[PDB]
C-alpha cells in the first residue's frame, strides 16, 4: 500500500472519519484509483473517499486515528504527504519530517452488518442541516428511557420531520423536500444525529438519505454514514401539541429573550420557574427565588386575547429563543394549565413545546 | 443609599472587582459605598482585595451595603447597550431599575464585609502598563502548579537598579524577565500568590493609563485608572536565577522560533504520554528531533539551523520546550547550550530581555 496526498485533501475525510482497540484506528484502503478512510464505534461508521492523481500502489491496514490525523494537521499548509506499509508499521513523509505509526490488520476492522434499503430520498443539505440544528438541543441524553435518546426522523406525504423530546419539553421541524414518502417513522442514536450534522460541510451537494428497518445511510459528496437506527418505540409527541391555541403573542425575539435572561437571574436555581402575566399589548414577567430576590421585566407585545397568567421553565424557553434566531416569535397560550407553543412569526416549520408551572 | 449610572460606566469596575469571586457568604458579595460623589465597588477573598471608584455625576445619596456579585454583575450585563441603572437601599433589599426592568437583590450589612490589614509602603514606582503585561506574560506559564514549596506556585517580583525583574519556576524550568522603569529603585524582592498575579494581569486594559505599585513587607498594590488591587505576599526562598542560568553555554543555535516550534509538536505526538521526552542531535547547521514511545512508534524531524562546533546530544521534555518557544512570540531563537546533563538556556535571538532555563532529560 502506497499513496501520495495533499495535506489537505486528508484532512476534511479526517475529521469526518475520527468522529465515531482497532475502534481507536481508521481503515485506510487503497483500491481502484481511491484512498478510501473508514471511523466506526460498531453503532455507526464513516468512510471518506479521496481521489489519487498521484502513483499509488493497493493494499489495506489501519492506524491510530488521533496520532495519524494530529501530524497531518501538524505538518504545513499545502504539505505532500507520502504513505507507505512496511512490514507491521505504517510509514509517513514529508519534507524531513518522518513517522512511524504501529499497525493493526484490516481483516480485523469490525463491519457494520448488511441490510436492505426500504425507504430512500434525496434533498439538500441545507434543509437536513435546518432539520437537524432546528430540534438537536431538545433530545434526551443518557435517559434511562433510551429511546428519547436520538431524535425521530418523520416521512409523511412530501414532508420529511425530524422530532426530539428529552421528557420534558419538545421540538419539531418539518420540511417539505419534493418527493412522494411512504408513512415512516425511525430513530436515530443522538451520536449518529451529531455525527451526521457534522458531515453536512454547507455546500451544495445533495444528500441521499437510505432508510433500513434498522440502519440509515447518508451519502453527500465524498463521505458515506451509516447508523443503526436505536430500537425502540418514540413516544406520542402528537399529544402534547395544543389542539387549539386561541390566544396568541408576536414579540421581538431578541427583546424577549434578553428580558427572559435577566428575569433567570433570580428564579429558582433547580426548577427555573418564570411567570407571564399577559395583557393587551403587553408582557409581564416575573421571578423569584427561596432567598426571595425578584425580577420584573414588562415589554410591548402585540397581543390583543383575554388576559392570563403562565409559568414556565424560563431555560427551556431560553433554549427555543436561542434557537429561532429570527426577528419575531409567536406564542401561543390556551390557560394557566395548558402547555405553550412558540415559533418564529414568519415560519411554521419549527415550533417547540413548553409544558405550565404553577409558578 | 441611592445612585444612579450609565450601565458602561458600571461594566468595567463591575467586572474588574467581581471577576475572581465566587463557604463564607458575605466573599460572594461585593461592598458598594456611596460617599463624597463616588461609587466604591470592592470585591475580597481575604488573600486580595480588588477597589474600584465610579464618580457620580447624577443625583445621589451616602450609604454602604453588599450584595451577591455576579447577580448584580449579571444584571447589569444583560440590561442594553445605553441603559440607566438605578440603584436604591430600600430596607434590607437593594433594588435596581433600569427601563422597565426591576429586581431585588438580598443583601448583607457592610458592616460584616472583611477589611485586608492596615500596612506601609516601603518601596514605590511607576511603571507602563504595557511593560507589566510584557514581565507577566513572558514568565506566567513556568510558575508551579500546586507545588508542597508554595512559594513556587507564585511569582517572584525583583527590583533591581532601575530593573523591575519577574522569575517563575517549578524545580525543572525557569522563566525570568528584566524591564527598565527608568527610577532608581532599591534591591527588593517579593513573591506574588498565583491568584494575584491572574489580577495583576486582568487589571491591564491596553489602554495608555500607567500602574503605580506600592510594595510593603506582606502586600502588594497595583494602581491603574480608578482601581485599586491589592495582594498580600508569599513568604518562602525563592531561587535565586543567576544560580540557575549556565555559567558558560558557549554552543549557540540559531533557528526559525516557528519552524522549531512546529517541529517539535510534531514529534511530541510520538513521544511519551507522562515523560515526553525527546531527543535533539546537533551538528553543524542542522538539527535533528527524535522521539518515541513503548509501543516503537517513532519520529524524526531535520530541520536547518546556524549552529558551528562541537556535536552533541541532548534529551528534554518537550513540553517545557514548547511552552517556551509558545512564550517567545518571535522571528528566530537563541539556544546556548553546555553538555548533554547541564540545562539549555533560551532566548529570543533578537532580544534578551527574557531568558528560559530547562533541566535536561
Ligand atoms: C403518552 C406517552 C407515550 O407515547 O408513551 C408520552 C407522550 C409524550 C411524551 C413527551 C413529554 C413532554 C414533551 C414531549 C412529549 C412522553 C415522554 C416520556 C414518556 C412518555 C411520553
Ligand atoms: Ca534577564
Ligand atoms: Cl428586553
Ligand atoms: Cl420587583
Ligand atoms: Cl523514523
Redesign the pocket.
Known sequence: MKFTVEREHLLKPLQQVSGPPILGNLLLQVADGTLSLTGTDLEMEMVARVALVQPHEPGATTVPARKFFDICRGLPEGAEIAVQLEGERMLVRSGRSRFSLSTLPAADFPNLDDWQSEVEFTLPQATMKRLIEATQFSMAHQDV?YY?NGMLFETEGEELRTVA?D????AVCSMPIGQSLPSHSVIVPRKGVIELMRMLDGGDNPLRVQIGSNNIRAHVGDFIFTSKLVDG?????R??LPKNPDKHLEAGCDLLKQAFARAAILSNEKFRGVRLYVSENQLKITANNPEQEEAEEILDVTYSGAEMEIGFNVSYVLDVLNALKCENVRMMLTDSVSSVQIEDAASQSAAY?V?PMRL
Do not use: I
Open positions: 428511557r428519547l423530546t421528557g420534558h419539553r419538545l418505540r418514540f413516544p406520542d409527541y399529544r402534547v413545546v409544558m
